[PDB]
Amino acid sequence: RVVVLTPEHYTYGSMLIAGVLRDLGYSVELRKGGADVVFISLQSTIHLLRYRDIINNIRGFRVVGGPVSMDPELVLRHLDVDLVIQGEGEDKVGMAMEVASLDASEIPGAAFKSPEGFIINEPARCSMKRALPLVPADISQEASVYIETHRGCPGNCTFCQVPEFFGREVRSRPLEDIIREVRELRKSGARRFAISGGTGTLYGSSRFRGIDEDAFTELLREISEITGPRNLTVPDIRVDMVTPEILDAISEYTNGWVFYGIESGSRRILRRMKKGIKPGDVIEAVELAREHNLKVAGSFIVGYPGEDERDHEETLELADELMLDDYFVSIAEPIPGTELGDEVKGLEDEDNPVFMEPSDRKFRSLAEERAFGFMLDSYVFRSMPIPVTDELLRSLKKEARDQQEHIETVTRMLKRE
């Protein structure tokens, strides 16, 4: 009857949509990678291009949702789909089914085309009470799953669409809902779990005073009592939203890793990214994490528009001084609908490091050169230095090249080239 399709991976959003359709009373299948109505969950912009042919060849009533829906014009440009639902879609799939079985222009967040242009409705927020996800029988073959704990983020990172997709107010799920969902996923075969939904430490937070360390500690404790502490992680932590109690809870109830989003060591680029942090904040957060005996990983973004060699040098200096336990390096991705996407869509190739000339012609661009250089230097920066070999060098080269290709493709898609 109804089939929910998601490429490459079993995403939490696809499982949630399938579970909502199941609770509504429909016969639902959740497959990775046909029916009368097909709900298509797309998580990356490049999915609009990589799977254009097979999606346009799917029979039946096709409905597309997910993060890519934040730019419905791009989706409808690449995909001849009956309906696109923007934003949260828990309370929208029933009306979409009634449309497939009701006028599509009456669904909040709906977006479709017609011989006289586009009909694009305003999206709306959903209640945090919703159906259990449909867990496929082979979820153990998939960390295994990202559990959403809260929705929305007060941040303003130009490279993130969460504040625009889910809102700027933190809406925390009921703790018992999270516990029951984790219990069900564990019964179904899932063994490794990651928190998700906005920055990690803002669960149970308030609009008036923000961080609630006791709520975060309680969340971590109650989840670890179901999963085991070694099987739980928290992936996105802001350096300005940590306390000693938060770090103690991470140490006692998770695998002991704190994943900071540092992005850059240049104060100028940090201001341009609207991260709301400065290098001193990162240094203090790493020091406080070390004092509580945590493992520390840091996420960095290279190739941001306007980043000259001075900014990259400052980022490398900071990364060396931090001596983190692990480093992750990514090339800036201009997500459509974000401030970074708006800035890159009008940026000429001579000003975009993804299309700027590198000093070494072995690299396809300056951004790939900086990415590979950072990735290589990280193995001599980290607290446990790894002797660089030819195999690791080739692996880093391949990773930088793959990131360069992905970013080039999504940038050319953003500019409608």
Ligand code: B12
């Ligand atoms: C965990 C995670 C991952 C997982 C994948 C799981 C997943 N994609 O869900 C991993 C770690 C593998 C990953 C990798 C990447 N990720 Co990621 N990831 C996330 C993260 C943090 C949480 C996703 C989640 O579970 N959300 C909670 C659920 C409930 O929300 P949801 O999935 O959006 O679903 C809701 C709505 O979209 C809607 N909905 C969803 N599907 C459908 C379908 C239909 C038919 C309908 C009607 C409605 C509907 O209803 C749901 C409930 O409201 C999000 C950020 C975020 N907080 O959303 C980024 C995010 C999805 N990732 C992003 C990025 C940049 C990437 C990478 C490309 C990074 C890279 N360069 O390597 C890769 C590749 C992704 C890919 N699949 O190709 C972007 C996507 C931007 C875009 N438009 O392309 C996001 C939004 C973050 C960001 N702004 O930077 N990611």
Ligand code: SF4
């Ligand atoms: S803090 Fe994390 S979730 Fe919030 S806007 Fe920045 S990157 Fe997105």
Ligand SMILES: [Ca+2]
């Ligand atoms: Ca307990």
Ligand SMILES: [Ca+2]
């Ligand atoms: Ca200090």
